[PDB]
Structures are given as structure tokens and as C-alpha cells.
Ligand binder design. Structure first.
Ligand SMILES: [Mg+2]
Ligand SMILES: [Mg+2]
Ligand SMILES: [Mg+2]
Ligand SMILES: [Mg+2]
Ligand SMILES: [Mg+2]
Ligand SMILES: [Mg+2]
Ligand SMILES: [Mg+2]
Ligand SMILES: [Mg+2]
Ligand SMILES: [Mg+2]
Ligand SMILES: [Mg+2]
Ligand SMILES: [Mg+2]
Ligand SMILES: [Mg+2]
Ligand SMILES: [Mg+2]
Ligand SMILES: [Mg+2]
Ligand SMILES: [Mg+2]
Ligand SMILES: [Mg+2]
Ligand SMILES: [Mg+2]
Ligand SMILES: [Mg+2]
Ligand SMILES: [Mg+2]
Ligand SMILES: [Mg+2]
Ligand SMILES: [Mg+2]
Ligand SMILES: [Mg+2]
Ligand SMILES: [Mg+2]
Ligand SMILES: [Mg+2]
Ligand SMILES: [Mg+2]
Ligand SMILES: [Mg+2]
Ligand SMILES: [Mg+2]
Ligand SMILES: [Mg+2]
Ligand SMILES: [Mg+2]
Ligand SMILES: [Mg+2]
Ligand SMILES: [Mg+2]
Ligand SMILES: [Mg+2]
Ligand SMILES: [Mg+2]
Ligand SMILES: [Mg+2]
Ligand SMILES: [Mg+2]
Ligand SMILES: [Mg+2]
Ligand SMILES: [Mg+2]
Ligand SMILES: [Mg+2]
Ligand SMILES: [Mg+2]
Ligand SMILES: [Mg+2]
Ligand SMILES: [Mg+2]
Ligand SMILES: [Mg+2]
Ligand SMILES: [Mg+2]
Ligand SMILES: [Mg+2]
Ligand SMILES: [Mg+2]
Ligand SMILES: [Mg+2]
Ligand SMILES: [Mg+2]
Ligand SMILES: [Mg+2]
Ligand SMILES: [Mg+2]
Ligand SMILES: [Mg+2]
Ligand SMILES: [Mg+2]
Ligand SMILES: [Mg+2]
Ligand SMILES: [Mg+2]
Ligand SMILES: [Mg+2]
Ligand SMILES: [Mg+2]
Ligand SMILES: [Mg+2]
Ligand SMILES: [Mg+2]
Ligand SMILES: [Mg+2]
Ligand SMILES: [Mg+2]
Ligand SMILES: [Mg+2]
Ligand SMILES: [Mg+2]
Ligand SMILES: [Mg+2]
Ligand SMILES: [Mg+2]
Ligand SMILES: [Mg+2]
Ligand SMILES: [Mg+2]
Ligand SMILES: [Mg+2]
Ligand SMILES: [Mg+2]
Ligand SMILES: [Mg+2]
Ligand SMILES: [Mg+2]
Ligand SMILES: [Mg+2]
Ligand SMILES: [Mg+2]
Ligand SMILES: [Mg+2]
Ligand SMILES: [Mg+2]
Ligand SMILES: [Mg+2]
Ligand SMILES: [Mg+2]
Ligand SMILES: [Mg+2]
Ligand SMILES: [Mg+2]
Ligand SMILES: [Mg+2]
Ligand SMILES: [Mg+2]
Ligand SMILES: [Mg+2]
Ligand SMILES: [Mg+2]
Ligand SMILES: [Mg+2]
Ligand SMILES: [Mg+2]
Ligand SMILES: [Mg+2]
Ligand SMILES: [Mg+2]
Ligand SMILES: [Mg+2]
Ligand SMILES: [Mg+2]
Ligand SMILES: [Mg+2]
Ligand SMILES: [Mg+2]
Ligand SMILES: [Mg+2]
Ligand SMILES: [Mg+2]
Ligand SMILES: [Mg+2]
Ligand SMILES: [Mg+2]
Ligand SMILES: [Mg+2]
Ligand SMILES: [Mg+2]
Ligand SMILES: [Mg+2]
Ligand SMILES: [Mg+2]
Ligand SMILES: [Mg+2]
Ligand SMILES: [Mg+2]
Ligand SMILES: [Mg+2]
Ligand SMILES: [Mg+2]
Ligand SMILES: [Mg+2]
Ligand SMILES: [Mg+2]
Ligand SMILES: [Mg+2]
Ligand SMILES: [Mg+2]
Ligand SMILES: [Mg+2]
Ligand SMILES: [Mg+2]
Ligand SMILES: [Mg+2]
Ligand SMILES: [Mg+2]
Ligand SMILES: [Mg+2]
Ligand SMILES: [Mg+2]
Ligand SMILES: [Mg+2]
Ligand SMILES: [Mg+2]
Ligand SMILES: [Mg+2]
Ligand SMILES: [Mg+2]
Ligand SMILES: [Mg+2]
Ligand SMILES: [Mg+2]
Ligand SMILES: [Zn+2]
Lengths: 138, 122, 151, 99, 208
RNA sequence: GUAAACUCCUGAACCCGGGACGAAACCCCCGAGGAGGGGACUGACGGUACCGGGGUAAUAGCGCCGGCCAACUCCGUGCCAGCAGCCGCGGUAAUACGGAGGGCGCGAGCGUUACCCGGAUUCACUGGGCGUAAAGGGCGUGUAGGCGGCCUGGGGCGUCCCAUGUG
RNA sequence: GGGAGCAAACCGGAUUAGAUACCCGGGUAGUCCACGCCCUAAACGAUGCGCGCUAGGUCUCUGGGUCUCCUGGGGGCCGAAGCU
């Protein structure tokens, strides 16, 4: 039935990266695109494209990964060490401009859905607006 | 427990109970001795300790310890109760305040005399 | 060469007909106070030999620390299975506020300004490992934009 | 000023009066989750023109009776028994609680 | 009421040389250099490993003994040093050297930080042409810390000030051996001060 | 333990002289009973604050010293007397009882009891859990409630920004 | 209402210091059926239900398809990552 597609997607990106997949898919959505756009446009994923799976609209997300490491377990670096949905359906999270988190002292990001559109944490403070704290990445 | 569960049932506020019902939440409680005695201590240790039942102005009747070597409490001695458990003596929740009322301080004691109502000597 | 210091020493045991033979444990940190830090744990039938072994094993497992002027680049909530620790940066003149363990580590790390808290198990040994793995995961805007570079 | 709110009529049995049920929502003080809550109001209807299942707008007004302190302002949309049923069913279940 | 009593025992405990007294502490002993070990029946016994608390404590008491100031006062400052924006560590030292009785010592008018207080209470001091006897006084920047009118001619004052000339003192201080005046140029500074105490240690101690 | 004595230096207390601010308006003439101007009265505190002169070295306690937790030795005592916030100490060799020496910590205060928050991340929103440690309902059906897929448009309740009022 | 076998309780034998038991010889309610109550359990995977996502190897039950195999639905084991 799916309760929340967004957290699913984030989870699909998360479980994908843990194994170092080249890319995975996820059902299409105007909204989901925006999250990927900002996600890739911030250097977390290579990009995406509206692929097709049995006439079913999906968005194939191309993953990014660090270089190989030295020593035991050359498990490469992650480009997304931490992805997590904030405002859940079980409890929506809305914020005023002031409240927006600093996320990992600037290093991190945090998508917000707002009446200006979807935009990262710094962007919100930039054009001075607040909205649903969708999630955050770093 | 899901947020919704929390919205409904909520969290259970702790509430603790007074380790010492000296009543009135008072720091001290006057009372009259009634059974000056001598009880054996708990399991690990051994040495007949000095205790006394007291009828308090708070209505209750409780046992309390007598600090220091030797004392001067008889059946009708008035005394001031301090409160402070004794791991050795099960059931004793209070302490006699030496040097107040019919309670006498320790005779000829140089160290920590304050904890026993003993003036400083010459 | 480096500043040597240990968190704890402990005597364990092991039953055996007629009695109980002992070993000693030694949790030791080593640091330059400029970035290099490491932690070792060695066991040996006597204390001194135990501290030495710990000192040795310690000098092995080293790690750099991206100190941004006495402080840390960014906070982190690393959980070492049972134990959990939280590092968090702070302005100068704050000092290192932490438990006996991370205190010993962060100090030899050349850190001087950072607030912390030991949530979960307080076990020294695991709290130690937790702090290490914690530092091992710190990053700077460099390494970061370096990964979001992929050039 | 002179507060005004919207709700469905859930009673018309009274003379020149109707009971209006108004919901309202707001984030939980400690848990955030937008939670619902509602309340019945006795409204003054000097013609019983408004009937069961009507969604309306009642306005803070001069005291008409012990409980009546709002006059019905205007009909929002007629016929919505579906909502009335929810409120009536909510009641029905109360029977299944006592002992 | 301040310390009073055997001070050189402090020299010995903190292990460091505490320059409280005048001549002596430069002679062949601040008490030290004859008994570098701590007081008491022991002291000269195999020293015991010190706890984090031992350290944060002593390094704190060492700074307090230095200014020979009360615990209540010392503390009310540290907290006041926190409210103020600016490195609380250095700032706290800042509020310390701004302390009047101390100004008098750093301006050389007195042989000791303690005889400095004495001179102060007895009123031998002035600040912008106004007598002051409260060692506590927070000396603002740009203040005529001069000797009292009456006080000028006096065995000690003359003697101390006499000995003082030539000896350039305090980067943030301006001694005028002429009229026996002096000025609090500005709040001191991190390196302008030198003291056997890592201030960060005191910060860590007052976290508890 | 520079601790004392001793040497020198300053001068709390005490004595003497001076001695307030707080008090300008009411009221009275000039003007007009207005605006303006001018004139005078009133101090409980108090001979107090404060200024000036003379001027004596001039109270120190209380807690603690086994680990937490800064601070160790001698003697007495022998599961006795007693200690104790928890862990625990005492049964001839006690830094834990009692005294002393010394030490540590605060200081006109020091300790004790009571109470509140903290630590307690141990009611966990921040920020906890439920295979074996406390914890999944014996299993279903279903009511209210809570929650809900992709696209287009209207409204703008939630949400968000601004100004303004209030705070 | 039914009652062959078995069998709490019960009686006897044995064992033992005792044996109100384990073993033996007997034996009733019950166990069986109808209708109606009772509603508990180590009612245990000691693991709530639904959905999506994250290596594979092998074993088996059952469907579909020209079929050293491919593709659904169950039942076990071994085990990536990961969790503990
Ligand atoms: Mg779409
Ligand atoms: Mg959250
Ligand atoms: Mg309740
Ligand atoms: Mg207690
Ligand atoms: Mg009394
Ligand atoms: Mg006393
Ligand atoms: Mg070991
Ligand atoms: Mg070796
Ligand atoms: Mg090795
Ligand atoms: Mg983990
Ligand atoms: Mg592990
Ligand atoms: Mg865990
Ligand atoms: Mg910490
Ligand atoms: Mg903690
Ligand atoms: Mg609102
Ligand atoms: Mg209601
Ligand atoms: Mg009425
Ligand atoms: Mg009426
Ligand atoms: Mg019923
Ligand atoms: Mg009920
Ligand atoms: Mg009933
Ligand atoms: Mg009833
Ligand atoms: Mg106080
Ligand atoms: Mg004068
Ligand atoms: Mg604090
Ligand atoms: Mg704190
Ligand atoms: Mg003499
Ligand atoms: Mg002289
Ligand atoms: Mg003389
Ligand atoms: Mg004079
Ligand atoms: Mg006087
Ligand atoms: Mg006079
Ligand atoms: Mg006069
Ligand atoms: Mg007036
Ligand atoms: Mg006038
Ligand atoms: Mg008047
Ligand atoms: Mg006239
Ligand atoms: Mg007139
Ligand atoms: Mg006038
Ligand atoms: Mg007068
Ligand atoms: Mg008078
Ligand atoms: Mg006079
Ligand atoms: Mg004299
Ligand atoms: Mg004297
Ligand atoms: Mg003298
Ligand atoms: Mg004492
Ligand atoms: Mg104490
Ligand atoms: Mg000790
Ligand atoms: Mg102790
Ligand atoms: Mg201690
Ligand atoms: Mg204590
Ligand atoms: Mg005896
Ligand atoms: Mg003896
Ligand atoms: Mg002995
Ligand atoms: Mg012994
Ligand atoms: Mg002793
Ligand atoms: Mg002593
Ligand atoms: Mg105090
Ligand atoms: Mg007190
Ligand atoms: Mg209360
Ligand atoms: Mg509490
Ligand atoms: Mg705790
Ligand atoms: Mg606790
Ligand atoms: Mg609890
Ligand atoms: Mg806890
Ligand atoms: Mg809560
Ligand atoms: Mg827990
Ligand atoms: Mg269980
Ligand atoms: Mg179950
Ligand atoms: Mg159960
Ligand atoms: Mg059960
Ligand atoms: Mg049941
Ligand atoms: Mg039904
Ligand atoms: Mg039902
Ligand atoms: Mg529903
Ligand atoms: Mg939706
Ligand atoms: Mg809905
Ligand atoms: Mg479309
Ligand atoms: Mg849409
Ligand atoms: Mg359309
Ligand atoms: Mg819409
Ligand atoms: Mg709106
Ligand atoms: Mg605007
Ligand atoms: Mg605003
Ligand atoms: Mg406003
Ligand atoms: Mg305003
Ligand atoms: Mg405003
Ligand atoms: Mg205001
Ligand atoms: Mg038959
Ligand atoms: Mg029959
Ligand atoms: Mg039968
Ligand atoms: Mg049979
Ligand atoms: Mg029979
Ligand atoms: Mg027979
Ligand atoms: Mg039998
Ligand atoms: Mg037998
Ligand atoms: Mg028998
Ligand atoms: Mg029988
Ligand atoms: Mg039968
Ligand atoms: Mg029966
Ligand atoms: Mg059958
Ligand atoms: Mg039949
Ligand atoms: Mg039949
Ligand atoms: Mg029945
Ligand atoms: Mg049954
Ligand atoms: Mg049950
Ligand atoms: Mg089973
Ligand atoms: Mg399950
Ligand atoms: Mg399931
Ligand atoms: Mg395969
Ligand atoms: Mg096989
Ligand atoms: Mg088949
Ligand atoms: Mg085919
Ligand atoms: Mg099955
Ligand atoms: Mg089966
Ligand atoms: Mg299988
Ligand atoms: Mg594994
Ligand atoms: Zn000296």
C-alpha cells in the first residue's frame, strides 16, 4: 500500500549505496524529482532519468561513490554516509525560517518543501522562507 | 511507542515517595522517648546498638539511632529527631540530635564535635 | 616520541584447579598533541609489561585528526554497538568538557575545545573504541567537496 | 473580532435553535503531530431555516440563553449527513462502554 | 578577610615558585630552593599519581593563591567572565589584573601583592584624584593610579618607588616615577601576562 | 616552619573638630488670581553619612583525610566501643572506630537534616525499548480513530513570508 | 446417553529409615457422543499486522510454459551486506 514514497526512495538510495550499486529505480513523481535534482545538483548522486519498467514510470537514480581505500576492506567512501527522512506522515514537521537546522555545521544539506518550491537549507534562509522539513543528507 | 500512541496515552510521570515521613516535610521533629533500648545490628556486622522509640509531635511513633559513645536518654526524655537511615539497623529511618533538648552531646570528644553537640574546650 | 597516557589498568582472572591465575589489562592512548592519536589495549601477566604492550599496540593504530583551531570540524553521534558517544565542536576558551576517557583521547589529539556526552553503556573500553571510530569519521570541507567533485 | 467559525448542524430538535459541531486542528504542544479536536455550539436560529446536515458559519453574538451565544450567519452548503453520521456513530459506540 | 599566615607553604605545595613576598622570594628561597617539596610530615615521600581532579584543582588554586583572593570572589568572576563574549579563559585573567590592589603591585608601588592590598585599604592610594581603599575596585582603562597626597612622603612608598625607576613594567601599564602616578593604559592581554597556570585547566575545573 | 620571638612599617577600634544631599512647592507681593519673575518657611533619619586631625597589631573557626574524593602517620581499642551517603570498616598488627601529629577544603562561617531540579538518556518530543534481560494481545472479524499511490485544475484550513497591534 | 482400552482419586504388593511416590496387581471420574458452560497454557518462532527496499548456494512441496531450463506460490538448511 505504501505509506510514504519519499522515505522509501531515500531508503532505496540508502540500501542501494550500502552495497555500492551503479544505480537503482523508484516510481516517478514531480515531487520526487525535485528531491533528486537538489540531491544530484549538490553532488550526492550523478543524476537521474525517467526510465521505463513495463510501461511503469520510474526514475533511475545514478549513484556516486568515493575511490577505493587502502588496507583491509577497501570498502570505498560513501557520497551519502547518511540519508534520513524527517517530516514523516506519522508526524509532519514544519518550520519557521529561524528554526531551520544548520545540518552538520554547514557540511550537510536539508531539503525543505516550501511555498517557493523545494530548496536546500541555505537556500531557504537565502530567499527567507520556511516549510516542511522533508529530510536531510550528508 | 508511535507518536499517535503518545498523543493519546502519553508518558507516565514518575513521582517518588518520601524516604522519611518525619511529616510536615520538616527538617526536624520534636518528640518524647518511650523505649530506650539496645538492638543487634544486621547480618554482616555485630554490636548492640543504641536506639529509642519516640512519640512525635507529628503523631507518629518511630525508632531512631543514638549517635556517639554512650548516652543519657531515659523513658521520658524529650528529644529532637533528625532523620537519616542506618544500613545496619533495619527499620530505623531517623537519628537523635545530640545536644538538643534532653539529648546530651558526647562527653570529652575532640573531633567532628559539631556533629554531636559538643562545645569547644579550653 | 609522542605523549603517552593510559585510561585504565585492570586485573582480570581465570579459574583453574587449585586457584585463579591473573592477567592485567592496559588501555593506553598515544598522541602528538598536533593531530596524531592512537589507542592500544594489551594484556600481560604483569602490570609494567602490560602497559608496555599497550603502549606498543597503541603506537600501531594511529589516526589523524582534522583540528580546526583546537576544535573539531563538526559533531558526530557514533555508536560503538553498546556504547555511544557524542562529539561536538565549540568556540575557543571553552576547554575540553568530557568524561575521563574521551578526555584522555581528545586531549592528546591536540584538541582543546569540544563538548561531549557518553550516552548508552559507560564501559571504558567500548567508550574508548567508540571515540576512535568517531574521530576516524570526521571530515573537512575539503574531503567533502572532494567527494562531491568526482573530477 | 466577533469570532466566526464553520461547522455542521447535528441537532435541530430545539425550538429556534440548532447545535453546530466545529472541528479545529493544531500541532501537539510536545509531539507536534497535528491533532484534531472539536466542540458543539448552541446557535440561535430564529426560523429553523437551517436543518440537519447543514454546514454553516456561526458568529460570536449577544447571549440568547444559558448556552446559546452564537447566531447562525449563513449556510455554507446544504446536505452532508455523512458528517452527521460520524458524530452520531461516535455517540452510538458509547453505549458499548458502560457496565 | 584574606589569607593571613604561612604563605611560603603555598610556594611548596603547588610545587611552583609563588612570588608573593618581596626580597625573600628572590633570595636563596621563595621558601623553595631549600625545600622544593610540599609541607607536612610527608611531602618528601614517593609522590602519588594525581587525578584529573587533582590537576584541575591545583592549577585553579595556584591562580587563586597567586592573587591571594577569596573563593567567593574568585568564583563570582569566573562566571562573570563567561557571560562576557570573548575567550572566557583569557578574559577571566583580564578581570583579575584589572583588580585595583593588583594594579598597585604591577605598578611596583608594593613589594608584595599582599602589601599592595594593605597600602590600598589604609587609603595610601588614589585613582583619578580620589582616595580608594577597596582592593576589589575594577580599574577601568586610563586611570591615574597615583599615591595618596599625604602618603607621598613615606619610608615605604618612597623606598619602593625609588627602587622602581628604570625597571620598565607592564606593556599595558605606564609608570610615572615622577609624581608617583601610573595609568591603566588598557586591559592586559593573553601574552602580556605570564603565570605558571594553564587557564584552560581552571575552565575545566569549574565545569564539575 | 618564616611559622614564632625579634626589627621595622602601616593604623580596624577609640578620641577631637567640622557636618549634609534628600527641600522646593504649597504660601507672600510684581504681573491679572494666568504665563513669567521675585521673596520666605519646613529634616524623623542625625551630629548619622561624609571630610579633616590625633591614634592602639587588633576574633578564628567548622568540615573532611579507605574508593567515589583534594588530603597519612603514631597510639588506644579487638565484630567490643563505635563508623557509615552507597560500596563497606572493627574479630592484635585499623590511613574507615577514638585521641594526637600532620594534611586537604572552605572561612564569619562551616557542617547537618528537609525540600526542588540536576545528574536520571531511568517515562526517552529532543532522546529508550519488547527472540532469550521487564515488555506482542492465544487467534480472528470489525467499529471509532490514526495513516494512505500517479496526473491536472479550483479553493487557501493546516504550513510559510511581510507589515501592523498586543506582548 | 456411552463405556473396549487406558486411568487422577482409591485399595493392595514391592522398595525404603519412612514411600501418602518412581515399579507391579487391581480400579473410579474421565477420556467417547449430543446440546450448553468454562476461556486458561511453555495458546512459543517465547519474534503484532501491512507495504517497499538490500548477494547468492543448495534441498523440497505445488502451479504455468517445448522444458540440461524458464517463471509464480509455500516449506527447511548454509550463508552477502548489515544488525546484535
Ligand atoms: Mg510523476
Ligand atoms: Mg527526529
Ligand atoms: Mg495519565
Ligand atoms: Mg540513605
Ligand atoms: Mg535546643
Ligand atoms: Mg563542636
Ligand atoms: Mg585484561
Ligand atoms: Mg613488545
Ligand atoms: Mg600486534
Ligand atoms: Mg552501530
Ligand atoms: Mg562490535
Ligand atoms: Mg544499539
Ligand atoms: Mg563526555
Ligand atoms: Mg550520558
Ligand atoms: Mg497558528
Ligand atoms: Mg470536546
Ligand atoms: Mg436558557
Ligand atoms: Mg431566550
Ligand atoms: Mg457490549
Ligand atoms: Mg468503559
Ligand atoms: Mg458488564
Ligand atoms: Mg457498574
Ligand atoms: Mg554561598
Ligand atoms: Mg587623609
Ligand atoms: Mg555546567
Ligand atoms: Mg553539569
Ligand atoms: Mg615572646
Ligand atoms: Mg623600612
Ligand atoms: Mg617601635
Ligand atoms: Mg595617619
Ligand atoms: Mg569610626
Ligand atoms: Mg565629632
Ligand atoms: Mg552647622
Ligand atoms: Mg515642590
Ligand atoms: Mg517659586
Ligand atoms: Mg508638603
Ligand atoms: Mg494684587
Ligand atoms: Mg495676590
Ligand atoms: Mg506665577
Ligand atoms: Mg538637623
Ligand atoms: Mg536632628
Ligand atoms: Mg561634633
Ligand atoms: Mg605606633
Ligand atoms: Mg597581631
Ligand atoms: Mg607583627
Ligand atoms: Mg576540624
Ligand atoms: Mg568536606
Ligand atoms: Mg584518603
Ligand atoms: Mg573516606
Ligand atoms: Mg576521599
Ligand atoms: Mg563525602
Ligand atoms: Mg572498649
Ligand atoms: Mg594494641
Ligand atoms: Mg594498632
Ligand atoms: Mg584488621
Ligand atoms: Mg586514622
Ligand atoms: Mg589537625
Ligand atoms: Mg559555600
Ligand atoms: Mg549550610
Ligand atoms: Mg515537595
Ligand atoms: Mg531528582
Ligand atoms: Mg546516571
Ligand atoms: Mg541513577
Ligand atoms: Mg525508571
Ligand atoms: Mg542511565
Ligand atoms: Mg515524551
Ligand atoms: Mg533503556
Ligand atoms: Mg521474559
Ligand atoms: Mg503472538
Ligand atoms: Mg505473552
Ligand atoms: Mg499469556
Ligand atoms: Mg483473553
Ligand atoms: Mg460490525
Ligand atoms: Mg464492532
Ligand atoms: Mg477512518
Ligand atoms: Mg498524501
Ligand atoms: Mg486523510
Ligand atoms: Mg502527467
Ligand atoms: Mg500531484
Ligand atoms: Mg485536468
Ligand atoms: Mg491539489
Ligand atoms: Mg491558509
Ligand atoms: Mg511580503
Ligand atoms: Mg515575522
Ligand atoms: Mg508581530
Ligand atoms: Mg507594537
Ligand atoms: Mg512589535
Ligand atoms: Mg517590553
Ligand atoms: Mg453407542
Ligand atoms: Mg453411564
Ligand atoms: Mg470406559
Ligand atoms: Mg488397568
Ligand atoms: Mg476401595
Ligand atoms: Mg493382600
Ligand atoms: Mg499405593
Ligand atoms: Mg532411603
Ligand atoms: Mg511412617
Ligand atoms: Mg494412596
Ligand atoms: Mg472407570
Ligand atoms: Mg469433581
Ligand atoms: Mg471421536
Ligand atoms: Mg454418536
Ligand atoms: Mg449420541
Ligand atoms: Mg450459562
Ligand atoms: Mg475450551
Ligand atoms: Mg490471558
Ligand atoms: Mg513450539
Ligand atoms: Mg513476525
Ligand atoms: Mg509480518
Ligand atoms: Mg540466482
Ligand atoms: Mg544437495
Ligand atoms: Mg514445477
Ligand atoms: Mg515457449
Ligand atoms: Mg504456512
Ligand atoms: Mg511443515
Ligand atoms: Mg529457499
Ligand atoms: Mg557477518
Ligand atoms: Zn616565598
Amino acid at each position: 500500500m505504501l505509506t510514504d514514497p519519499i522515505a522509501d526512495m531515500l531508503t532505496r538510495i540508502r540500501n542501494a549505496t550500502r552495497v555500492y550499486k551503479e544505480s537503482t529505480d523508484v516510481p516517478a513523481s514531480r515531487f520526487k524529482e525535485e528531491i533528486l535534482r537538489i540531491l544530484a545538483r549538490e553532488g550526492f548522486i550523478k543524476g537521474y532519468e525517467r526510465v521505463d519498467v513495463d510501461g511503469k514510470p520510474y526514475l533511475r537514480v545514478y549513484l556516486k561513490y568515493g575511490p577505493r581505500r587502502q588496507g583491509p576492506d577497501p570498502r570505498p567512501e560513501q557520497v551519502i554516509h547518511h540519508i534520513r527522512r524527517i517530516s514523516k506522515p506519522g508526524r509532519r514537521v514544519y518550520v519557521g525560517v529561524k528554526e531551520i537546522p544548520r545540518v552538520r555545521r554547514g557540511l550537510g544539506i536539508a531539503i525543505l518543501s516550501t511555498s517557493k518550491g523545494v530548496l536546500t537549507d541555505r537556500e531557504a534562509r537565502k530567499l527567507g522562507v520556511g516549510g516542511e522539513l522533508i529530510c536531510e543528507v550528508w | 511507542p508511535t507518536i499517535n500512541q503518545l498523543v493519546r496515552k502519553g508518558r507516565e510521570k514518575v513521582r517518588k515517595k518520601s524516604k522519611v515521613p518525619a511529616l510536615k516535610g520538616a527538617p526536624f521533629r520534636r518528640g518524647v522517648c518511650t523505649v530506650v533500648r539496645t538492638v543487634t545490628p544486621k547480618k554482616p556486622n555485630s554490636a548492640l546498638r543504641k536506639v529509642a522509640k519516640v512519640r512525635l509531635t507529628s503523631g507518629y511513633e518511630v525508632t531512631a539511632y543514638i549517635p556517639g559513645e554512650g548516652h543519657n536518654l531515659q523513658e521520658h526524655s524529650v528529644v529532637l529527631i533528625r532523620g537519616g537511615r542506618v544500613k545496619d539497623l533495619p527499620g530505623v529511618r531517623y537519628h537523635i540530635v545530640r545536644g538538643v533538648y534532653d539529648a546530651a552531646g558526647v562527653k570529652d570528644r575532640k573531633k567532628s564535635r559539631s556533629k554531636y553537640g559538643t562545645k569547644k574546650p579550653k | 616520541d609522542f605523549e603517552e597516557k593510559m585510561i585504565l589498568i585492570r586485573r582480570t582472572a581465570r579459574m583453574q584447579a587449585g586457584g585463579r591465575r591473573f592477567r592485567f589489562g592496559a588501555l593506553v592512548v598515544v598522541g602528538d598533541r598536533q593531530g596524531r592519536v592512537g589507542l592500544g589495549f594489551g594484556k600481560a601477566p604483569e602490570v609494567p609489561l602490560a602497559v608496555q604492550k599497550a603502549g606498543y599496540y597503541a603506537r600501531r593504530n594511529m589516526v589523524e585528526v582534522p583540528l580546526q583551531n583546537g576544535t573539531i570540524p563538526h559533531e558526530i553521534e557514533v555508536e560503538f554497538g553498546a556504547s555511544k558517544i557524542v562529539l561536538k565542536p565549540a568556540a575557543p576558551g571553552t576547554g575540553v568538557i568530557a568524561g575521563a576517557v574521551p578526555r584522555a583521547i581528545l586531549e592528546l589529539a591536540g584538541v582543546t575545545d569540544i563538548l561531549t556526552k557518553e550516552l548508552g553503556s559507560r564501559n571504558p573500553i567500548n567508550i574508548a573504541y567508540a571515540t576512535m571510530e568517531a574521530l576516524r569519521q570526521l571530515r573537512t570541507k575539503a574531503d567533502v567537496e572532494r567527494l562531491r567533485k568526482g573530477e | 473580532p466577533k469570532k466566526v467559525l464553520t461547522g455542521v448542524v447535528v441537532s435541530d430538535k430545539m425550538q429556534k435553535t440548532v447545535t453546530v459541531l466545529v472541528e479545529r486542528q493544531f500541532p501537539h504542544p510536545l509531539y507536534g503531530k497535528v491533532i484534531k479536536r472539536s466542540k458543539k455550539y448552541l446557535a440561535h436560529d430564529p426560523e429553523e431555516k437551517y436543518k440537519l446536515g447543514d454546514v454553516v458559519e456561526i458568529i460570536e453574538s449577544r447571549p440568547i440563553s444559558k448556552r446559546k451565544r452564537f447566531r447562525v450567519l449563513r449556510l455554507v452548503e446544504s446536505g452532508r449527513m455523512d458528517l452527521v453520521e460520524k458524530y452520531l456513530i461516535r455517540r452510538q459506540n458509547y453505549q458499548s462502554l458502560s457496565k | 578577610g584574606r589569607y593571613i599566615g604561612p604563605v611560603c607553604r603555598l610556594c611548596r605545595r603547588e610545587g611552583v615558585k609563588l612570588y608573593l613576598k618581596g626580597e625573600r622570594c628572590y633570595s636563596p628561597k621563595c621558601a623553595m630552593e631549600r625545600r622544593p617539596y610540599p609541607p607536612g610530615q610527608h611531602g618528601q615521600k614517593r609522590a602519588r599519581r594525581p587525578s584529573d581532579y587533582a590537576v584541575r584543582l591545583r592549577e585553579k588554586q595556584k591562580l587563586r593563591r597567586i592573587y591571594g583572593i577569596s573563593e567567593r570572589q574568585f568564583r563570582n568572576l569566573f562566571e562573570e567572565a563567561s557571560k562576557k563574549k570573548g575567550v572566557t579563559g583569557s578574559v577571566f585573567l583580564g578581570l583579575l589584573e584589572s583588580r585595583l590592589d593588583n594594579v598597585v603591585y604591577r605598578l611596583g608601588f608594593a613589594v608584595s601583592r599582599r602589601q599592595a592590598r594593605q597600602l590600598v585599604r589604609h587609603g595610601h592610594i588614589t585613582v583619578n584624584g580620589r582616595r580608594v581603599d577597596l582592593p576589589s575596585y575594577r580599574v577601568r582603562p586610563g586611570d591615574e593610579i597615583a599615591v595618596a597626597e599625604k602618603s607621598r612622603n613615606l619610608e615605604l612608598i618612597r623606598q619602593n618607588l625609588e627602587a622602581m625607576k628604570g625597571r620598565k613594567v607592564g606593556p599595558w601599564l605606564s609608570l610615572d616615577v615622577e609624581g608617583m602616578k601610573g595609568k591603566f593604559l588598557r586591559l592586559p592581554d593573553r601574552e602580556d601576562l605570564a603565570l605558571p597556570v594553564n587557564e584552560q585547566l581552571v575552565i575545566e575545573f569549574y565545569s564539575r
